[PDB]
Write an enzyme that holds these catalytic residues in place. Sequence first.
Site, short mmCIF file in Angstrom:
data_model
loop_
_atom_site.label_atom_id
_atom_site.label_comp_id
_atom_site.label_asym_id
_atom_site.label_seq_id
_atom_site.Cartn_x
_atom_site.Cartn_y
_atom_site.Cartn_z
N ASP A 174 0.65 -1.34 -0.10
CA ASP A 174 0.12 -0.06 -0.08
C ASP A 174 0.78 1.30 0.03
O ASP A 174 2.03 1.22 0.51
CB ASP A 174 -1.08 -0.04 1.13
CG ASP A 174 -0.25 -0.46 2.50
OD1 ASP A 174 0.79 -0.86 2.59
OD2 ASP A 174 -0.85 -0.21 3.54
N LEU A 221 0.47 3.96 1.83
CA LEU A 221 0.71 4.72 3.16
C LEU A 221 2.02 4.17 3.69
O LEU A 221 2.17 2.88 3.66
CB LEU A 221 -0.64 4.59 4.01
CG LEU A 221 -1.79 5.60 3.73
CD1 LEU A 221 -2.24 5.63 2.44
CD2 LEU A 221 -2.76 5.23 4.76
N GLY A 232 5.14 -7.31 13.57
CA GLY A 232 5.49 -7.68 12.33
C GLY A 232 6.43 -8.82 12.42
O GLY A 232 6.01 -9.77 13.29
N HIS A 253 11.54 -9.32 14.45
CA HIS A 253 12.34 -8.30 15.37
C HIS A 253 11.47 -8.90 16.52
O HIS A 253 10.31 -9.34 16.80
CB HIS A 253 11.85 -6.85 15.02
CG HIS A 253 12.08 -6.43 13.38
ND1 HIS A 253 10.93 -6.84 12.66
CD2 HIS A 253 12.89 -6.02 12.87
CE1 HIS A 253 11.27 -6.39 11.44
NE2 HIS A 253 12.60 -6.06 11.38
#
Lengths: 297, 297, 297, 297, 297, 297
Positions: free
Chosen positions: A119, A121, A230, A233
């Site tokens: 996307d 954004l 995510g 991490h």
Amino acid sequence: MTQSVSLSDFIVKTEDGYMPSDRECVALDRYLSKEQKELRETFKDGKNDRSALRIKMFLSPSPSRRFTQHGVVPMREIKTNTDIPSTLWTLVTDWLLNLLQDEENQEMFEDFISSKFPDVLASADKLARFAQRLEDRKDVLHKNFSKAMNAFGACFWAIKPTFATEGKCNVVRATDDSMILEFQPVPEYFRCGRSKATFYKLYPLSDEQPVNGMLALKAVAGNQFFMYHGHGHIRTVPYHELADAIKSYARKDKETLESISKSPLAAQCGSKFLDMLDGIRSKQKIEDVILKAKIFE
Amino acid sequence: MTQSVSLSDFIVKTEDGYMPSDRECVALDRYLSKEQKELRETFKDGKNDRSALRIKMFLSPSPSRRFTQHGVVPMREIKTNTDIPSTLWTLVTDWLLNLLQDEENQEMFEDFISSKFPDVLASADKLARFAQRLEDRKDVLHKNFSKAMNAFGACFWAIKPTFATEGKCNVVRATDDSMILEFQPVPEYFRCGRSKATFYKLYPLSDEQPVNGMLALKAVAGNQFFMYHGHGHIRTVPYHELADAIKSYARKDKETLESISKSPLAAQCGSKFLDMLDGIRSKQKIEDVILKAKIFE
Amino acid sequence: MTQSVSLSDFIVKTEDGYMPSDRECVALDRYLSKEQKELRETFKDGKNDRSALRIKMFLSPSPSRRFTQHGVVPMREIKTNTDIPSTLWTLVTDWLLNLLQDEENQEMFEDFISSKFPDVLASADKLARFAQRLEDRKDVLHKNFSKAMNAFGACFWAIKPTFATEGKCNVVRATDDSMILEFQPVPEYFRCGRSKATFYKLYPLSDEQPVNGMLALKAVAGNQFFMYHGHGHIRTVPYHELADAIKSYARKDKETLESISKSPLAAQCGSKFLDMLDGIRSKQKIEDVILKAKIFE
Amino acid sequence: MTQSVSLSDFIVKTEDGYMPSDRECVALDRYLSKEQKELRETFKDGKNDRSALRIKMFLSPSPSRRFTQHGVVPMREIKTNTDIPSTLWTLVTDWLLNLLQDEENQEMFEDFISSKFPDVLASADKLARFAQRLEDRKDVLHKNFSKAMNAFGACFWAIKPTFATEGKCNVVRATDDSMILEFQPVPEYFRCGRSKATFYKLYPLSDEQPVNGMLALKAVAGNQFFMYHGHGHIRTVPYHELADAIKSYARKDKETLESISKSPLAAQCGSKFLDMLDGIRSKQKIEDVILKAKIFE
Amino acid sequence: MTQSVSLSDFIVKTEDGYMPSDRECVALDRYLSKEQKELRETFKDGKNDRSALRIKMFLSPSPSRRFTQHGVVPMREIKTNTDIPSTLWTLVTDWLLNLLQDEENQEMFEDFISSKFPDVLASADKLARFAQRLEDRKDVLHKNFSKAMNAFGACFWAIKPTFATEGKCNVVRATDDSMILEFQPVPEYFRCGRSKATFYKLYPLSDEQPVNGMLALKAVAGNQFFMYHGHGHIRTVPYHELADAIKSYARKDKETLESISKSPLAAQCGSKFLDMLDGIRSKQKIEDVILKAKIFE
Amino acid sequence: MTQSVSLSDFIVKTEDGYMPSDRECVALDRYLSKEQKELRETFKDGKNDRSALRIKMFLSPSPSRRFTQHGVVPMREIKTNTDIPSTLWTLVTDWLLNLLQDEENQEMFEDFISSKFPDVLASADKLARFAQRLEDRKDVLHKNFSKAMNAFGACFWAIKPTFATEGKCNVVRATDDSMILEFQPVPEYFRCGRSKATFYKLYPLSDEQPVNGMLALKAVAGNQFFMYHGHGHIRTVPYHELADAIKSYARKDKETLESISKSPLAAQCGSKFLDMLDGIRSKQKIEDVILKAKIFE
């Protein structure tokens, strides 16, 4: 929640060469092109893969009627309503237009934008941290254009970020496998939105689960919390801001949550995180369970 | 009335390359060339197409006797006596001499000057507004030399000005056909002469008479007046300054007035403008009819 | 909603002379004084006139244990968590500490703070606009200390603001009774939060209902909305931001709403405002009624 | 070891008013006064209370023969041979001479210098840290002259330093009794000698032995060492620099060591420090015992 | 030879307060006062004590007819025709006018000017060296006005210069009696005339003939020459410039030479200087004897 | 013709202290005071000593309703419509407001304004030349306030100007009686209107007709013209600008012309000036007689 800055707010397509974008006026948006109006009508008609339609919209040229003195007016569908500091806009636009003086580079940019961008954004703090590393002259990004382009792409959720593709950081401690990094608050004249305090991270080295990394982070984190936002991490956030994180956990999709729950690295984080994930999977009220998981033992 | 700044006050012809012009001294003008003195004598003899003779004069080279330390003295027939700010002169001369470093560009300039220029003189405010758009670095004129060239040419009554070839402006409102723009007072260190307040305009889009443009302008203008100066625009001026406009209506030629009166766009402006045109056609006294048309209903 | 900046974030009490306040650390807040801890315990105990207890807390001195190198740490009950630009803080603190070099001025400040202040919190945009008028040297506030002080007072909801006690403004049009003023967006390096566009206002002159003021404002406002926020003004807001205004209408007290509804000036605003007030009095859902009142006829 | 900067290198006595001191030339030192030469001869004769003789020397005026264009040459007995940055010298001399424009202040300075000063010499890093707090305008020292005077005096081993009389610091954590502070490296253009890294400290509140302070410091120190240099503090140093500390332990007097060993606060530090003190009391070789105590368990 | 800068070129008398002097124009000098014209006529009549007449002229006021926009025109008899740097004039005039804001200081200046000044003229290099010591802020002259005034007076041959009243210098070596100083070339933007290289000097301490001073100077001077210009000094000059010195020896008066020859300090300088003095007393040709005494053994 | 800048465009009366005047808005002028409106009505009624009514208007205070943020709006009868450079306005307003900080000075200003001022209006070039002498620090006006006030008053046709009360000038030549001065063009950033070239003048000394002044001026003027504008001067203008002078001769009153013609100094100017005066007295057409008198013999 976390405001997002679109790509079109920095640069829009034109006939041949990309032009800087002015958000001062919106009256000129009435006119459009045949393909542009067709795609606008289809987008307004029904909810059918809005992101793909937006990407298709961003890759079509613009007529000469939309030109103004300062620049080119963007479309009303790929433009946000959040203010950003002048320095950030100037620096990003200048660098991006400097890179875009090549037909082959144009083709490379189009191939990348069509390859992995989910996307348009992107998070504002990611942009601020990336521009933090671009303002100073003595860095690595200037010499290696490809690495800088990877960094900018991963800044908008494109590829998994490694150490060399992160923002502004300074390694504080390492070990046999994986490292731990420390971040700092961004200076005032780059800030756009709320402020955040110091918070560390952790990056597994190649594939294996860390063994001493958990001990090192526990020594460093002290009074903090663990999470698996995510993939790839283990971020740490203060107790207060975790409140807002729960809101960010509401918009997550069922398939994404299922994929997250099926990772050994998700299990490696600790104990309370799995309890919080089970609580959000229970589909009960958010505040009570959040405070139950937020108790200080 | 409105003082005009000639082209020769900025740049004069020389042997091969154009040189900046110094108006500090006029004693060197006694010497001239054979063709130059012949044309001067013919011009002083009788009134026969003065503008064509002036254009012919401007296109002849100059001898080395007229050179001084600063630059080259112009002729006494194509030089004005109005002072202009230093910044305007410096900027215009610098850009114009930067563009003229090419034989092909020299030929293009000569072809344009021989094509559509009716007279050397040009309005001061047009030049100031054009220089307003050239001082700032982030504009469109720098990248596209041709468009800036047409803008500069139309600044001196050569080309009908479109939106992209106007001065400094910012579109405030549009519609299906035609647009309305707003102007602002020019800053102090560019001003040369009297000052003017805010005043709008209107530009028909392609060919058709606007329908909602009149309503939009009436909503915007409020307390103002309508006019059809030149062709292709509907300018608005305050009630006071319209006084001076009547003086500008005295010097208009009969053929030009007849051509203006034979345009449907002239009829489209309103009601009082036709009455004023009939009054000026009546060849009566100017002040009484002007005040009669200037009454506030 | 609209974030508020407390008074203690700019200045806190000390033994004899007021000192600048540092929000860098909150570790020192553990220590306190006997009256301070008693008031903190009473405030935490139950909900009994929190504002009066807060005002009493702000008027008690502080021990020497809370001193640091930069300044004095404030209390945890009269301190906010919103960031503000450095220039605003520096200017306000400098001026306020410059004024506070007098025992009689100290007594006057205490009397004013005990006279009409309803709560410590104040709107951020009010502070920004007030500082806009204090940065420039050529104003009126510098010469007249008392007139300047009433501006800061009314900046935090203390007295009814007149024309001379407003923020930064420029009268655009007047009439026999009452005036209309125009505001402009605050520059970037003062902004703290969201941005707002142009919006006018209206101030009745002495006591009587305006007659031509409604016509003048209707001519000026064009596409806008009417409101009666507070008392003694008729503000205008754009259609979009009115959404947020509905949220501000939720926190309003029943007694305050009843007092507002019993004013002829409230009836004078128009027609749709009374319908909106009746809708919010109906205690129904906010969004549907808001969109019903927000329809464009 | 740690170079010391004498007081006379900044300012020397004169007839009536103190004058800045120039170390450019030492040729003028041949001439002296009767009392000055008598004291010099007595000092050179035998080792009898050198510090008291030095203090007596510093409190006698100087003749006019020693004056030069820049300033006054000091004596050869109270002058060092270490270079210092220009900014530090300029700032300290300017402030000290600004303070000394009063006979009563002169008498106060003399009384203080005769009260508790053990020797003229003072550590360089203490002076640098003190000047760090004096360069910035927004501090506390400017308003309170007395507190700044105490700070400067205690900078040269005169008064037991509290929190308000320390150098440049920022409290990172507190508790019921005692606090812990963090220091930072001094910037380059103040540095005079070797560089030191981050190191914490700790201080008692009134009289009692801390209970949670040891736990907090152990949590903070991590990999570090404990010590009881001076009285009233528990400093921490890195393992490497502790080497040099052993040299500083060689020059300590037997009576001072005995007084240090007879303090409960010395026992409170830990376990290895007492072993190191016993080792240095054993009067054996320093290197082997130092490495034995420096082993990492 | 060595050009001299008069006092009137810096400042002239006026009605009550001294005013700066402008040498731009000399046409206004035609008008004068009765005493002024009488003294001018007497001065032009015959050669009778020109210096005393000049001093009397400088101490009389001036009428208002001589005033101009910049300042006051001086007389044609006490004005030179040598150009001086702007900085020197500005600094000297500013300081002198700053000092002259007092009636008692005015009386003191008049008493000093009437006490020991032999003539208005003064050497240019003396003024340059004196202003070298006045430009820098950290000196002694600022605090002690009396010593600065003595220095300025001795700059124009008024009193015997001591060490503290000299120009810009730095003592390089001392001894039991007398000292030796070193001078340096004056920077470019102070220079007015020819340039001179490094040259030392010597000042007897109180009354007695130096014993080791000759040895020290001989060690320092190396390849140089000795002289006894004026009284109370033993200057050294390079071999080349000594040529010009012979010209300066031509204008010396017989009585002054006789007084110089009757001093033991003149005998103490060496051997060749007495031979040169005998040669100039022989009244023979200057060049041949000059080269005979200038031979390098 | 020559535009005039009124006094009210720089400063207007207020309640107690004079305030700077803002010409940005004229909307607030609707409100007024009882005496103010009565005087406005009388002024608008009939033509009866307009200047005296204007002077009376300027000496009445203003209400608090006319106050704005920047300053105070003037009246519509004592305000001009000519633009002036910002620097001139700032400097004049700053100096005048600095002078007006005294009640006795206020009374002196009122007495002067009521004593000899014929009308508020004053020439622009006179003001520019006066401000030329006030910008530089090293002048005479700063020390003597009375002379500066006389100069400013005579700038607006109040006092016959002497040499010390003129603008910016530099005496080029003198003689036994009277002097001749030279003027220069005013720099660009002070100019307001048309430009003028070099032109000299002449000022009789005390009472007698000059004898050599005519010869000196004839030597200096060369190609120029003579005139007797005003009284007490013999100005010189170039041939071209004399055209405009004829227009200035049209507005002259019959009584003023008769008084001018009855002066021996008017006869002393020359020969052609009397012919021109007779021509303008003939009441014939201006252009033909002007060119007849403008012929170059």
